[PDB]
Amino acid sequence: RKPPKGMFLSQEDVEAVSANATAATTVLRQLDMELVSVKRQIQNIKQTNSALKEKLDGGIEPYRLPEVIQKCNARWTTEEQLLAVQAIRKYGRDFQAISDVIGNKSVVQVKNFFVNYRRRFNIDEVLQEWEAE
Amino acid sequence: PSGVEGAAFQSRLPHDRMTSQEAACFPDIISGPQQTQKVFLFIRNRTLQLWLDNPKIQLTFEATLQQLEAPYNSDTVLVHRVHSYLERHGLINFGIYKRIKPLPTKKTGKVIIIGSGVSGLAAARQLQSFGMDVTLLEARDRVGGRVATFRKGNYVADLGAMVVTGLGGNPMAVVSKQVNMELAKIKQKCPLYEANGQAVPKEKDEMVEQEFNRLLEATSYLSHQLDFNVLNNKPVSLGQALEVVIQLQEKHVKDEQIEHWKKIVKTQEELKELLNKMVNLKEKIKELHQQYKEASEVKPPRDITAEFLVKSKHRDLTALCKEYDELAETQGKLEEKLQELEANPPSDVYLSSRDRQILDWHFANLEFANATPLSTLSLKHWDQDDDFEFTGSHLTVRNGYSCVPVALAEGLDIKLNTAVRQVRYTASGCEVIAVNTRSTSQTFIYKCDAVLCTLPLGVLKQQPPAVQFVPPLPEWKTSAVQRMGFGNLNKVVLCFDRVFWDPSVNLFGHVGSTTASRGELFLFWNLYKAPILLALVAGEAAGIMENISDDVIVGRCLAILKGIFGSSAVPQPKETVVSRWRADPWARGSYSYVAAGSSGNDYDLMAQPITPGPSIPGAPQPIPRLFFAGEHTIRNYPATVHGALLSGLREAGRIADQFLGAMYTL
Ligand SMILES: Cc1cc2nc3c(=O)[nH]c(=O)nc-3n(C[C@H](O)[C@H](O)[C@H](O)COP(=O)(O)OP(=O)(O)OC[C@H]3O[C@@H](n4cnc5c(N)ncnc54)[C@H](O)[C@@H]3O)c2cc1C
Ligand SMILES: Cn1c(C(=O)Nc2ccccc2COc2ccc(OC[C@@H]3CCNC3)cc2)cc2sccc21
Known about the structure:
The complex is a heterodimer. Chain A is an all-alpha fold. In chain A, 60% of the residues lie in helices and 0% in strands. Chain B is α/β, with parallel strands linked by helices. Chain B has a 5-stranded parallel beta sheet with strand order 8-2-1-12-21, covered by helices on one side. The radius of gyration of chain B is 37 Å and the shape is elongated. The two termini of chain B are 34 Å apart.
């Protein structure tokens, strides 16, 4: 039913080395030349990606910003109220980004802000401005 | 190997069933009730058992009946039929026995036999054993034909047949008892030595051998499963099949490599895309950070919009700094993977050239066994006799195989130096025309009821014909002769004084440099008591080495023999012989092979006897007159001694049934 171990011969590829008297050497030379091909292509991308690595040299350590740990507070000083409005205007609905930019509020605290203040800061209107972007 | 059942096996018969031959002579029984048959087989099997655990003496009907146990006693005619049948078809009372009753006073019927090869001799004895008048005609000055032993002083080497290929079912088992043959086993270890004179590394040897065996299986699968047995409406050789298979491996070696390097570049390109994303994000960062710094530089107090800017810029930056790390993570995974793909590269070659050479030795060994280039063997059929090979070790005949024909030729009318030239057969009888080999002009004429042709297939093939048939042979016969293959294989005998090789090693090989000359002296044999080394010429090489003088050939041997062993240890040889089996005109080659385009069926054609046309038109159907035996008549044992023998025995049966009648079919 099956050829010996590690010997490979499908019906198809027998017939393929039969057609002419040099399908033998033809089929074999195609791959010889198809191989040298893929090897030169490899070399290209080694050099291409080697130059791109040189430009990443330094990582981003120069532009890294110290961590800070803010203890989520429940009250909204006028200060961080105003940060919010501006954050909404810029970030739209990115509740995360807003919670970060303010620093001391959780992502839920931001959510219930939208509703609690929707009235007093016309937040609906504000989002429409961000809409146009 | 136990019981009467063992005698059946030792006589190539199924203990539990009736053969088709037996059906023909005992149609009543095989047609009959189960029980009657079961009886028959025992009577048969038992009788055989008797013959063979003592084949030194005739086994009579009474002697057999003697060892009879009921209900097997009951029927005395049955026992007689059986014993007669067995005796007729040389299953018992063959070879060399002591007779009980000296021969019948008077002979009956006259037969001429062509050739005193084993096939000839076997039948001659049988016929004479059945009291016909028999005369053999040998062109040679000696019996045996392709059994040819060389003798000088204590040097004894076989140039022809040398091996008994197992004893389990072999007739020669029985002959071995009847004649003193010194049967010695063969040690399988065969060390190889490349051109340099340096053994092949044990690791290599094992791999290539294993590859070779796989390459064969390959072809068989290739033949039977993929049905790849025609190409350009020409039948496919074994050599073609191998070439094909090899290429496909060589090809698949490449296919792997390609697929592996393509897996690399697919990843190499995923990385390129990442590295861009990375490099661009680094720029957005550099520049953004700058902005944040500037926004931070604005000393307070400051209104809320300026405050917001710092925060927004601060967050926008830590956000971009997150992305980049996720990417440098992704990068490290792809980067390590790349080096692991690079770590395990699919194999570079299928086989080297130093390999391909060693492989070519294993092929030469195959061309040796079948005595022909693999380009000539039938892919479908070359190994058709593999199912009937005997059991047990292969032995040499140490004292020279010639012992066996010579033994057989005792008390036989043998005209040596009598070359048959023409064979005429008619309804009336036949006449054979020979000549003396020494004075070709001196002419002989023999008349007989029947002729038995044991002419070698090479002779039969000869064109223009060495022997002429009158009338000429039917096209069905001659076509078979054309289709069948008659190979060649040659031995070189080296008689030294000192044993300068390893005596614990029976045989060792030498690896020829090229495919073309893989046959040349590719294998050597210390198999004899004396200090004697044989060297084989096989394959394409055999045919060509038959135009090189003895001296040159021994030159080449000695040279080869100094690589392995060193110019100090290798003396000149005292006596040397080289064979030339294809040039030998009473042979025209070595032995048959199922050539591409033939089948084992042709072997059966060559055994069919020939019946002449009637003398007077509308006269009754004649009796057949011309019969055939030899190594090429026996489908299941071709190209061996035992087959030659068996073919002789067989005809002796066919002939006697014709000319003495069969009193056992009652
Ligand atoms: C090198 C070699 C090694 C072998 N090794 C083995 C082995 O190891 N084991 C094995 O089992 N078998 C072996 N054989 C095969 C074996 O030798 C044959 O199968 C067998 O001996 C053939 O017997 P035969 O009677 O069929 O033909 P032959 O033995 O040739 O007998 C036919 C006879 O006819 C004679 N003759 C030819 N032309 C004429 C003519 N015009 N007129 C009259 N007579 C003629 C011949 O001279 C010959 O004596 C080997 C053969 C060779 C060549
Ligand atoms: C030449 N020869 C030999 C022979 O000299 N063989 C030998 C010599 C030293 C070591 C080992 C071997 C075994 O190697 C084989 C070689 C051939 C073989 O089948 C050959 C027949 C002929 C066609 N079908 C099978 C079996 C074993 C045996 C036989 S039987 C018929 C011919 C022949």
